[model samples]
Target chain A: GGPMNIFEMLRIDEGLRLKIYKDTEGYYTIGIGHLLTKSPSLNAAKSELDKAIGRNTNGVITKHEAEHLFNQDVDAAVRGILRNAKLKPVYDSLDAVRRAALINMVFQMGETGVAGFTNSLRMLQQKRWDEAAVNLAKSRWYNQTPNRAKRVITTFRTGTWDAYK
Target chain B: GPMNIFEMLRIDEGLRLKIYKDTEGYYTIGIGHLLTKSPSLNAAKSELDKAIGRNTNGVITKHEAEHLFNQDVDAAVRGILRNAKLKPVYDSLDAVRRAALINMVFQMGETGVAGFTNSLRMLQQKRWDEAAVNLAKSRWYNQTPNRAKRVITTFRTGTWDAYK
Candidate 1:
């Protein structure tokens, strides 16, 4: 009904830096691992970063602004990508952690990369359970890190999509 | 550009899966890379701090680290091959030879490897024995006599057993 109570967890799990840094996923990040890209929230982050650090050099943001920017970027990620996706019903079917996982996937890889998981998404839609998860495991994403694949696949194994509640 | 492959390689050697003091006695973690001065390193430290409470040294999942390592390795391969002259030669070499080149580059940058003037010339001329002999005589070998010998042996034999 309001901001994700899990922001704290995301913050802790993702980590925070006042200075601009690159994330494990290789995006320029700052303030709780916010990936800097060309977007409204990113521009805002830049605005905040510039004000705080100056010039083209690296910098940080206020804790308040960091949280706000996380929300804005996430709002775009979920509302912009998931809602705008062709598989809205399918996405809407996920449980909270699972949903967040997908959002996080989108967050790391961008829309095109995750969207390419068509076969797995269809499996998810059909409620194929293990097949869907296994299919996901077969992709480059899974091969990118089978350990992460295992964790994400577990979400599929425990089916039930929907918003975090 | 895209988190330079050399930089990533440096990190892997510096950071560790678990935090520990290096030979220089500095706290480090994650791929044997830097722990101090890097905001990302500290940020990672911050997450661990929040999760376990102060210097508790939480773990990054093996899979996650593996994935990033793979990406960096791919990038490293791409980077070393980006040198126009090196690409064709790299392509011409068999897998074992290619591995030898990559290992050499990782241990020493392209220019450093290129410093083997006579050796490189012999290598290009396909004078295997001459290349091995010249490389064996270098200061690199003087520093790591065993390693230098191994590299020379690999150059002569084209097998994995030679280098460090």
Candidate 2:
């Protein structure tokens, strides 16, 4: 609970691993929650996800996929985000605008976008707002993933997200 | 008739955006279907989501927050599994197992021992027959009516298997 992870909580013996496999919802939810934001308790978050999923599909979802959709593979998701988020290598320290924007972006695209715009991370770190914004905007995630791009842009431009909140 | 997710798909703008912003879950489904899941379609989602609420949750749920329980469970699962490195990927991957597992863990602590502990070897090699027998050990499954069976019973021991 105190900066620990889900793996530590469960006994992932071979059986449990298989159980993890069997429990596809848990596995995926873990990845989604893990990768998205370390700020909130996952249980409560997944509950929100389950509700979203239920709403999205009339409670007819795979339910595990509901968990997966929580942040998309939630288990690997948190570690994936933190694993690289820790590197701060390129994305380590960005201006406030870029940092918040990227959070929404990665929440949508996972590590691929985070790693892809590694340069943008540098630009934002340097406090090059225009360049950083431009760099942040020009990504595979941005062009390819339009929805994510817009949301991130909104976060930067307006500093408030009515939809995501 | 109405709209699906592939319509204009604009974002929440002006009064409409205000409406979507003011209300919630009125319209939207499908990936990229903001204001619900994409940027183009909002009006359609509003009508649909309204009816949906009427049908599904009896107006109990309207917007995104309706599924709070699912979200909490998902978060807990992520927190628990974050450390495991080589967790097996999904095969026919479904979220039911994860939900059930969470419920199991919620009821029983770590030492409670759900899953096939005693018969790990059989379940390991993908032995369906033995796996079911082993999975039955979970107190989580036995008394739960057919809740866990939806996942466990399909181990393919006999000639029969669940279609769905």
Candidate 3:
């Protein structure tokens, strides 16, 4: 009941497979409410975005004017894991390296980070070994995130990512 | 609303100060539409303690967060104002300094290094500018981020903080 680990759902979800830079439906960035983007203009869309995020995200998206921002939403959604069952505890249960890698994945994926880790979820799925390691490398998040991508990759190949786990 | 500065305000004592900690009351860290932290919040209490801790060293009232921010900013502005022939205080330097100054207050006051949600990312990424920008996003934006920026710039400049 505390924070859901999302990854725990790996039991049910496929490997945590995700497409990089999927601009269409599944992923969005610099996005405003439900993965939409618009300039500082367009008051109508802004208003709708604001209302939708306020309602769905419980005000975490936050209103700049008429629109809701993604950074804020990311924070709120990531924090939403606090509501899941035994998820966070499971993460806590892992060793430090595994914990950080998985946590970073959690941070990147949000509820999806944990629960929606479709194919490349963790050590469970095979394709994930390379792709999961690669995912961290490509993010502006990990661009210079200091040892994150490297460590994750090392973990993936050596199977030591979860050595601590 | 592009997720930058100019958005996010902390509702406090009837004033919307842009706070960063995830408290609910008085609208501190009011990212979620729902007022999360209470006026007297436990979590916010912890976050504010972090801000206070950065300034104090066993009772050091340094507020140096502000001064560091200013000096750091002035250095950048100084770079822009370099005359190469003669150096006079440029007007834009002052203007930029003032902008950077107040911005720092809003930042460090709300989110202190080691105490913030994204501070780890900022430090890890070595994203001094973006880190400074996030610092500016805090309630103490008025405090300026020159010092923090300076640190990043210094780090970039490879001005080692050598210790024996």
Candidate 4:
């Protein structure tokens, strides 16, 4: 009927891993696919989380901590999407579901990676949903994470919450 | 004979790695940052711990201290820029005079400094000596005489020698 919560979409797509685990791409990740190996580094992440949680996590975290990290990561993704001056207008014009799709893509691939889809973003600006989905589907991300890509692309094309289910 | 605001602030405020009491008896940390009273000391500690990525048992690293100082400086500068009455005066002043205003805001907050109506007007009109005199007549000057003299001289002469 309408767009689902961005958190719900991310939870379904990323899965809540309480323990630190490696992603398919071999990055150290945890808690709704929060990438720990990239910016903070694994040790830094451990130190931060350990201090926050008030004990040694030993590679494990509480659901509350997981949700905290998820919120921060999602905020970062949304801010990154908005920071792209060219994408801001297109992102603003889209419906809730389409906007969520864009944030989901940014969460998975980062702003720089998503910015590479120039044609897809242009199609999005034109409100050509089908063409935009097709363009996204042609990317290496689609080949790497076909199921996630299909759901996000479907969300973009249909502008509904069905993909979240 | 020029110095950045951060260096001036560090010299004025000094640094403390451990949580200590300020002159007014507030729980202070970092570079003279009075920890938020509402958060409670434990909450402040936890927040700092999270930011610094380490278990700081009433203690912090020099880098963490500097980070907090830098953040406070940025907030003070932004607050000065955002002030409706002060913005134009801030824009028209030389860099040294701007630093003096920023320093005042950092010490007393924007609202407290905004209480200096005559002094700000004098600054707006480029009446530097009168502005310094007006500032010197305040209770702030009585409370912190040494710091006040330096800041007033800076405003009067548009010189950074005091900060140096």
lDDT scores of the candidates, listed in order: 0.56, 0.38, 0.36, 0.78
Best by TM-score: 4
Instruction: Give lDDT tens digits, candidate 2, residues B34-113.
Output: 22333434445455456335433212232333232233343444433442321221111123323333333333323353
Best by lDDT: 4
Query: Candidate 2 lDDT, tens digit per residue, A102-135?
Result: 5444544666656666666665556665666676
Per-candidate Cα RMSD to the true structure, in Å, reads: 20.9, 19.7, 22.1, 13.4
Arranged by DockQ with the best first, the candidates are: 3, 4, 2, 1
Off by over 4 Å in 2: A1-137, A144-147, A150-165, B1-65, B82-125, B154-163
TM-score for chain B considered on its own, for each of the candidates: 0.59, 0.38, 0.23, 0.87
Tell me the interface RMSD of model 2, in angstroms.
13.8
B29-134 in candidate 4: lDDT tens per residue?
8898867554367766776566567788889877578667756776776676678776666656665677788888888889998889999999989999899888
Let me know the DockQ for model 2: 0.02
lDDT of 2 at A4: 17
